[PDB]
C-alpha cells in the first residue's frame, strides 16, 4: 500500500477545508466526510495506481505559528492555496507560506492552488475588491507565482462548482509519487 502525506496550507477562509471536503466526497464508495482532516485517509487512483492520501488541514491553525509546524514532518506533497477573490491571500504565498513550507518541508513538491475560481467572474466580489482598489487574481499571476516559488505546478479550482478539484489531487499525487 502506497501512502502519501498531504498537508494543505494558506490564509484563513481561502477555501482549504472545502477543497478537502469536495475531494473526499468524490470518493467511491461514498463515505461520510467529517469536518476535520488530520491524517484523514482518502483512497485515490491515478494512472492505474491505488494511492492512500493522508490529508492534513491547517485550517484553524493559520495563527498558531509554533503549533502549526508540528504537522510538517514527513510530508510528501503540499497544497499551498490562495483565493482567486483575494489578492491578499496570493501575496502571502511568497511572504508567509513558501518560506515556512520550504523550511519545514525541504524538497517536498508544492502544488500552487488558486481556489474559488468561480468568484473571478462574480460581480459582487468585483465590487467589494474595488473598494480596496483590488481585483480578482488573473490566471497569469498564479502561473507566475508558481514559477517564482518553484512549485511543481499551478492549478485553479472551485470547491463550489467542483471544477478542477479532481485535477488538483491527481497532480498532487503524481508529485508525491515522483
Ligand atoms: N464561492 C466559493 N466559496 C468557497 C469556495 N471554497 C470555499 N468557499 C467558502 O469560503 C469560506 C471559507 O473557506 P473554507 O474552505 O470553509 O475554510 P478555510 O479552511 O479557512 O479555507 C466558506 O464560507 C466557504 O463556503 C469556492 O470554491 N467558491
Swiss-Prot record:
Top enzyme category: hydrolase
Consequence when changing residue 17 to N: Decreased Rho protein signal transduction. Decreased substrate adhesion-dependent cell spreading. Decreased stress fibers assembly. Decreased cytoplasmic microtubule organization
Binding site for GTP: 10-17, 28-35, 57-61, 115-118, 158-160
Modified residues ((Microbial infection) O-AMP-tyrosine): 32
Gene3D superfamilies, A to Z: P-loop containing nucleotide triphosphate hydrolases
Consequence the record notes for mutating residue 61 to L: Causes constitutive activation
EC id: 3.6.5.2
Assembly: Interacts with ARHGEF28. Interacts (via GTP-bound form) with RIPOR1 (via N-terminus); this interaction links RHOA to STK24 and STK26 kinases. Interacts with RIPOR2 (via active GTP- or inactive GDP-bound forms) isoform 1 and isoform 2; these interactions are direct, block the loading of GTP to RHOA and decrease upon chemokine CCL19 stimulation in primary T lymphocytes. Binds PRKCL1, ROCK1 and ROCK2. Interacts with ARHGEF2, ARHGEF3, NET1 and RTKN. Interacts with PLCE1 and AKAP13. Interacts with DIAPH1. Interacts (in the constitutively activated, GTP-bound form) with DGKQ. (Microbial infection) Interacts with yopT from Yersinia pestis.
Record PANTHER family: RHO FAMILY GTPASE
Family annotation (NCBIfam families): small_GTP
Protein name per Swiss-Prot or TrEMBL: Transforming protein RhoA
Organism listed in the record: Homo sapiens (Human)
